[PDB]
Design a protein around this nucleic acid. Structure first.
Ligand SMILES: Nc1ncnc2c1ncn2[C@@H]1O[C@H](COP(=O)(O)OP(=O)(O)O)[C@@H](O)[C@H]1O
Ligand SMILES: [Mg+2]
Lengths: 754, 788
DNA sequence: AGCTGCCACGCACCAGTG
DNA sequence: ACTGGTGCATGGCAGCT
């Protein structure tokens, strides 16, 4: 095998698998890497088995690697951004492709979901907005121009794919895009005056087409994500809020873990999207609130039926790409059968948007009857070996199967004919690809074979024979099986012809069913978790009553202590002093999350929630350097509609430098920015603020001392903290009695002055 | 799911269930014919872990029995998959002969593979120890024992408190941890891998003594210095009872156990071991560790030894001065020894497999290759004037007799296993050459018989072949087969050939198949017989491997001391550290901007330095290098400096900044002594302004006045620069920085005195806090500055 | 070279016969 | 109590395109 590096040249940046019997083997830096990612030995060659290529392809793909299969030439290529088989895809997690680039004016950006067809473009102006979008969208594969100057954004990222500047050319991209969608201009989509981002979507759509070498009819539209259509959240804020991802890397004890009790995978992906994309436009919010309130009674009724629909989104993608396997068509049929029950249940629900999803759902009765008659109840995984088309769908196929079936029934009778004639109880008719049909006597009885029996194969304890009669029916069976298997393949391709016309309507359905799932779910969550419906006010403000952390109340097992919040423009900054130990931090995060959820359209963890409009949520809660950097970002971009959450800035540098930076930040946020702010500090000197300025108030956390421990209470109440707790804590940790005594003396000395 | 009494099973399952019952909690591979099998839930679990099909075995006792299995010849692949997941596997083989057996063939469990007892090349990592350990707790302290099962190293220790015990777990890092059912402090142990809850009786003391004594061939354990250590003996007894349960052979390489005393070595808490990144960085990787920079050893047994020394610095003034000499003496000779030393290889673990009677042909070949480098190492080391080196030349041995044994017994490149023969060589056993030479009736019978029969019959398709199932045969094509002598006896028929047998070939077939089986078994006798001849000299061989490893370590530390430019430190009587132009041995190599070397001077009258200076200044580095230079000087290595003078050091502590933070400080305050080196990297954490500092101030005083330890005490609290004024023994140093207005400047140089100003705003402005806010903070700061 | 399906094997599960 | 023949996990490799 000298001649194989000649195929490595064809695409160097992609790891090359190479058939070598029943395995795929790799060379050079494609071995070093493939052992460090997948875990396999390094003889420089590594290799996976053929029985689990899909397993090992998905793990490479999920680590942001394209693979190329070789069997000789390159027959297949998978890439992180463009896979659509259900074996390479995490069920409840979006898998986006993306392109990014940079003008002398700003950035362009586009994500594709190659299964839903969800195509978005944006145009981030500064680089922090850009980074926010990268964290949020979190694409499996990023395309980017060499051009690209600001490499620190995408520097450490899976699936980077360097593209030439000419692929990002505007005019070429407008056409390719207009051709894809069947429009003359891109005005129906809202993006015709949005060139930077159009150039990203141009590069992406062209890369996508290349990975598939097929039409992508399911991609029929594009939307632009505006900035002022959304509560902007920096990456450090999405991390600290643990919306979808705990700081620990995974998915436990996160907002989605508690709010996401949807019943279809497509509903789960959509909700997680909604949770990362709070919208500022109350019209849609009041629309969601009202739907959620309407479907509350109907939740037990709807969800068992909705669960049956399954992941129709991703199935429909495999219809669009013409790769759907028999079970895919079978689940599409199963889903269709739910639609009359879903439409019946939803019919009396008094909401305009629920009835609109009801219509959007469709019924598709013809396609239900088509697949009911065309496919058997539980068809094999593949079409390969037939057994998928139903009985009595195609009169011709039935004749062929009966010619086979009856030729096979002859050979069974041949068995019993030969058994009765020869009187040899071990006689049997078997079948095998190497020999066709055969009579088999055992070795003990083989010497008494009739002398018309032609010998063919000697086993250890048996002999095999053919006779003219046998081989006659071998043909009868095999031509009838071969023709019926050909008619099945053709009739299966004909089901795509009948299904594909209604591809658009089908995509509408799956989307409606994916939104019904989200809205019914959020409905169940509100009712089941004692949430209430928040109202919106004209000027900024957050009035909360007995509010809670939506996760911590569910995840811990101690009684969760609820608190109020009163932020108006006449009271826009609380100085939270006292012990933290999770208490302040929790109070602050439950504020953001409550706000986050009002603006997702969900009910919220509280007795009452009024809330003015919010444009950004900053949460600096988690070097001194990093703290000051995240603080710099708030002070540079916070507005008077911003929600700002600050966790004890100053620790990590000198008392005075730190006290002086806290003082100046709180001042700057109360007086200049005027953001609604929870400024959690430890500096007691900072409680003198509410006197020195308008619109600042003091609240605090306390601790109660009992027995020989201490209970860190979680009730925020008015006034400054009037106690400290580090000596008390050290005492209980068993720092020498005398040390603490001297510490208490020092502590008094130091306070007395200021 | 029926009543499944003894009588309810077949004879096969009765036997399976007795064996399984003596292994209820771990997977049992059960050798049935050509397969290792599993049943009931084990098969269900095996199907999920190993990725094999869950099947069944037909029954007449209710429902069917879940089964899974794997052909015997692939057992090792699957055994690996399980032990890397941390599963024990009991291996049960067939003992008897089925053809002389009424009921089921006899079956013993012959070994148990568990993560800490594995000793095969494929499941272990060249450069990383794989210890079994055993922990146990009393009302007053801990008992703890470790075992490298593939070397014999058997150690015993009796950690005083919870936190020394935490440090020992981190250090030894057992792949498997047997522990007592009554174990109170599960916080130390829960979460670890290879956890094995064990019943109390295994930790019973008189049974420990009896079993340990027995194993070492002694009447008491006085000579080993452990007779006084019942806490730890109880650990040792459980370990050893377990070790022997897993192996089910003698373990003659376990000829000793040693006490690991508090004061024989520098003791580092869990925090210190992590902050100096000795073999693991703070990501779990081995990149940019002390070990990455120092470990250019050529043999694996050397690498592991170096890593143990690094982790346990010895306090013995004599051993250190001798190791220090060995380095200096050997510096000229590394270039020539290192390539030879390499060729010895991993002799430690090869003598393991020899001792365990497991070693394969290629283990014996590499042992023979090792012996073949001792004569070159003997010459090389003679000219090195150093007593310690010549003691290691003597202890390395030579073993010319065994070299000549393996040179005459095994061939140059043997197969992986003896399973299939071809191992033993021509000359070694005369009976063996007789037997091969009959079954080497190749170059012989088959070819001529073929010609003769083709030419006599006149049938050109005629070939002579052998197939494993039908035996030897004469083949004729189907078109010529109706012409074959009526003497030919039809044997195997195919689609297009017929194969036949004649008396002459059948007689050659019985002759060659019995010749080959005889030749195989006698080979296996000869192979096993090498272990009998080798085994006596095992003690001397273990001392060989142990010297070759220490040579690899020292020769390494000498090369490192030349290339990286280190000098020999010297020791003193009272506590103190006096570094001249010292460097962080790791940071100095990763960075490219040359390393700003610094002094340090600790002493009993200058024992606590309060370190000040900016974020990113160099405070932590200056602490870590102090500790590393201590750590290195006390493994006998040379040190990254112009001159180092270091007195004695019992423990090293470390706090690097709630209920666990404070506890960590109490541990320091209670256990530090006048000989301890204490690093506190900005501690002091309260719920208010002055809270945490007040504690740090109180702690500082306590370390200076009461404990009198050598403390490096970096803070951001400027208030602590007043310490030197009040306490005795305290002083102020700082890592310098420069102004230039709008900009940074981190000079990385340590100088006496407090910093001139704290740089919190300068660093805040560098992060990009609005210049407008930095302004108002500077305004506030002179407000605050004007109080004093 | 690729693909199918016989065989390794001790043991248990039948039927068909003492 | 037989005689006799099946039929099994997986992986090696003969037999046959
Ligand atoms: N002696 C030195 N020479 C050159 N660089 C140094 C030196 N000491 C520290 N540094 C650099 O400073 C960085 C941080 O040092 P560090 O001690 O952590 O500052 P801090 O005092 O805030 O802990 C390190 O990453 C290292 O590169
Ligand atoms: Mg530091």
């Amino acid at each position: 095998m000298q001649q194989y590096l000649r195929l490595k040249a064809q695409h160097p940046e992609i790891l090359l698998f190479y058939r070598m019997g029943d395995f795929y083997e790799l060379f050079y830096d494609d071995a070093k890497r493939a052992s460090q990612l997948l875990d396999i030995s390094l003889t420089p060659m590594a290799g996976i088995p053929y029985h689990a290529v899909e397993n090992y392809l998905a793990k490479l793909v999920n680590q942001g690697e394209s693979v190329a299969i070789c069997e000789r030439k390159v027959v297949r290529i998978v890439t992180p951004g463009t896979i659509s088989d259900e074996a390479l895809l995490q069920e409840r997690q979006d898998n986006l492709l993306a392109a990014i680039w940079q003008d002398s004016k700003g950035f362009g950006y586009a994500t594709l979901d190659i299964s839903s067809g969800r195509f978005r473009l944006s145009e981030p102006a500064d680089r922090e907005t850009m980074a926010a979008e990268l964290q949020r969208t979190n694409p499996a594969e990023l395309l980017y121009a060499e051009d690209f100057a600001e490499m620190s954004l995408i520097e450490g990222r899976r699936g980077l794919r360097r593209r030439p500047l000419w692929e990002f050319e505007i005019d070429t991209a407008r056409q390719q895009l207009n051709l894809q969608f069947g429009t003359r201009d891109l005005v129906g989509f809202g993006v015709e005056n949005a060139p930077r981002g159009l150039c990203a979507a141009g590069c992406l759509l062209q890369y996508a087409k290349d990975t598939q070498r097929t039409t992508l009819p399911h991609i029929r539209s594009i939307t632009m994500e505006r900035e002022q259509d959304s509560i902007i959240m920096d990456a450090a804020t999405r991390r600290n809020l643990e919306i979808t991802q705990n700081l620990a890397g995974g998915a436990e004890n996160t907002l989605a873990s508690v709010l996401d009790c949807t019943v279809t995978p497509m509903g789960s992906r959509m909700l997680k999207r909604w949770l990362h994309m709070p919208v500022r436009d109350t019209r849609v919010l009041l629309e969601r609130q009202q739907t959620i309130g309407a479907l509350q009674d109907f939740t037990a009724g709807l969800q068992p039926v909705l669960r049956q629909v399954g992941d129709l989104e991703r199935i429909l993608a495999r219809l669009a790409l013409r790769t759907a396997r028999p079970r895919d068509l079978a689940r599409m049929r199963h889903a269709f059968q739910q639609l009359p029950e879903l439409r019946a249940q939803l019919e009396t629900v008094d909401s305009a948007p629920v009835q609109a999803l009801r219509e959007k759902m469709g019924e598709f009765a013809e396609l239900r009857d088509l697949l009911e008659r065309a496919i058997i109840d539980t068809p094999p995984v593949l079409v390969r070996d037939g057994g998928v088309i139903a009985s009595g769908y195609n009169e011709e196929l039935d004749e062929w199967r009966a010619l086979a079936d009856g030729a096979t029934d002859y050979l069974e009778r041949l068995e019993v004919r030969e058994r009765e004639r020869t009187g040899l109880d071990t006689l049997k008719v078997g079948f095998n690809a190497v020999h066709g049909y055969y009579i088999q006597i055992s070795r003990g009885q083989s010497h008494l074979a009739p002398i018309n029996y032609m010998r063919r194969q000697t086993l250890k304890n048996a002999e095999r024979y053919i006779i003219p009669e046998l081989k006659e029916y071998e043909d009868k069976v095999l031509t009838s099986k071969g023709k019926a298997l050909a008619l099945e393949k053709q009739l299966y391709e004909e089901l795509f012809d009948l299904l594909l016309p209604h591809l658009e309507a089908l995509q509408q359905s799956a989307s409606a069913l994916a939104e019904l799932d989200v809205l019914v779910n959020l409905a169940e969550r509100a009712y089941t978790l004692n949430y209430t419906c928040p109202t919106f006010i004209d000027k900024p403000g957050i009035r909360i009553t007995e509010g809670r952390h939506p996760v911590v109340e569910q995840v811990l097992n101690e009684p969760f202590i609820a608190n109020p919040l009163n932020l108006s423009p006449q009271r826009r900054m609380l100085i939270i002093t006292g012990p933290n130990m999770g208490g302040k931090s929790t109070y602050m995060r439950q504020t953001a999350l409550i706000a986050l959820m009002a603006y997702i359209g969900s009910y919220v963890p509280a007795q009452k929630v009024e809330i003015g409009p919010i444009d950004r949520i900053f949460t600096r809660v988690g070097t001194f350097m990093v703290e000051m950097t995240e603080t710099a970002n708030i002070l540079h971009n916070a507005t008077e509609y911003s929600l700002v959450l600050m966790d004890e800035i100053g620790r990590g540098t000198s008392t005075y430098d730190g006290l002086s930076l806290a003082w100046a930040c709180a001042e700057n946020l109360a007086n200049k920015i005027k953001a609604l702010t929870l400024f959690a500090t430890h500096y007691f000197e900072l409680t003198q603020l509410p006197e020195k300025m308008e619109g600042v108030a003091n609240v605090h956390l306390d601790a109660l001392e009992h027995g020989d421990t201490i209970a860190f209470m979680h009730s925020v109440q008015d006034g400054a903290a009037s106690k400290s707790y580090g000596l008390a804590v050290a005492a209980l940790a068993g720092v020498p009695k005398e040390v603490i005594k001297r510490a208490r003396q020092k502590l008094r000395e130091l306070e007395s002055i200021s």
